[PDB]
């Protein structure tokens, strides 16, 4: 349920907003994973 997965197909604007939020959370998680102080 994220925009990263190209196989994901949103059905409506609510699903699109949820996908945007999940993508933001996943991007933050990936940044924290790749961060090296």
């Amino acid at each position: 349920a994220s925009l990263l997965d190209s196989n994901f197909v949103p059905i409506n604007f609510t699903e699109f907003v949820q996908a945007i939020s999940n993508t933001y959370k996943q991007r933050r998680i990936q940044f924290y994973e790749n961060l090296k102080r």
Binding site: L3, V9, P10, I11, N12, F13, E15, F16, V17, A19, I20, S21, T23, Y24, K25, R27, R28, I29, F31, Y32, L35, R37
Partner: protein, 313 residues
């Protein structure tokens, strides 16, 4: 949905080209936890326990045993929803403004929806980072004409009931006096039982430039930054100390621990920019779009943030 909403399709296609906010470097991964809310207030309850008397020795037959009591505290946080509007070109009208090297109307400052949304999102993320760092929302370098915010909405710089130190105007260049004030603030710091945690310090570019000078007769093999790191390690149980430079700050030094048990960030899951479904349309080639973002959600224990301000005037 993508077969009917070109704007949504373009937002999904171009959302990945927007850089991550810089506020993520000021907090540990465990310190941030999203919440589901757009506007309003949310309550958090913290529970504590205490011992009522000395332990009871278990021998033979005993009916009376020492007790453990409990207590709770409630903290209320506020979240606010804000919106921007921006004009752009209609999807079907892009072909008439396409050029050999670009797309859009230079003479009228009209852009494709994707580029306009990307620029607007970048500006909104810059504003959100500024609000998170400073506790105020403004679009002026002077810092005036501030938007009035709700109570229980604070940033790292304006959080009440913290340690505040002021370096005088005459000592604005005396690194020894600045370090004296920093040491006083660090001594005034009260971390309780969570002292064994890494610490984070954020400084302005001028302070960062001053911190790389040799320690002062000048001393070799040691810097003011090293002295500050040793001083902070004297209180953080010899834990890690991180130093960051932010252009948003101005003659300010901010010191705080990177522990979720003391300072936490519970932002709304819609805090980052999100497009709105409503799109203004007419018979012309100009359309309008809206972007929403949510502000608020910083919690911190009292007397755990040190703010040193160097006075210029």
């Amino acid at each position: 949905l993508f077969d009917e909403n070109y704007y949504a399709k373009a937002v999904a296609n171009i959302i990945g080209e927007v850089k991550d906010p810089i506020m993520y470097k000021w907090f540990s991964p465990d310190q941030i936890e999203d919440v589901d809310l757009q506007m309003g207030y949310q309550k958090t309850v913290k529970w504590d326990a205490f011992l009522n008397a000395n332990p009871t020795t278990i021998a033979n037959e005993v009916n009376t045993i020492s007790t453990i009591g409990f207590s709770s505290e409630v903290v209320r946080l506020n979240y606010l929803k804000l919106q921007y509007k921006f004009r752009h070109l209609k999807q079907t009208s892009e072909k008439f403004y396409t050029s050999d090297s670009y797309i859009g109307d230079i003479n009228n400052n009209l852009l494709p929806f994707a580029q306009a949304y990307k620029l607007a999102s970048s500006e909104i993320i810059k504003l959100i980072n500024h609000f998170v760092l400073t506790g105020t929302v403004s679009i002026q370098k002077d810092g005036k004409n501030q938007k009035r915010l709700l109570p229980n909405m604070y940033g790292l710089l304006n959080m009440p009931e913290q340690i505040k130190e002021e370096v005088a105007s005459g000592d604005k260049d005396k690194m020894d006096k600045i370090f004296e004030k920093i040491e006083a603030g660090l001594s005034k710091l009260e971390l309780g039982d969570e002292f064994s945690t890494p610490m984070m310090v954020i400084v302005d570019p001028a302070t960062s430039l001053k911190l790389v000078k040799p320690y002062a007769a000048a001393s070799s093999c040691e810097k003011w930054e090293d002295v500050l790191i040793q001083t902070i390690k004297a209180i953080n149980n010899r834990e890690d100390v991180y130093i960051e430079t932010s252009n948003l700050l101005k003659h300010k030094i901010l010191i705080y621990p990177l522990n979720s048990e003391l300072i936490k960030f519970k932002p709304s899951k819609y805090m980052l920019p999100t497009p709105n479904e409503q799109v203004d349309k007419d018979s012309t080639d100009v359309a309008h779009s809206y972007i929403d973002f949510v502000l608020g959600g910083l919690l911190a224990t009292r007397k755990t943030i040190l703010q040193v301000n160097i006075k210029q005037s």
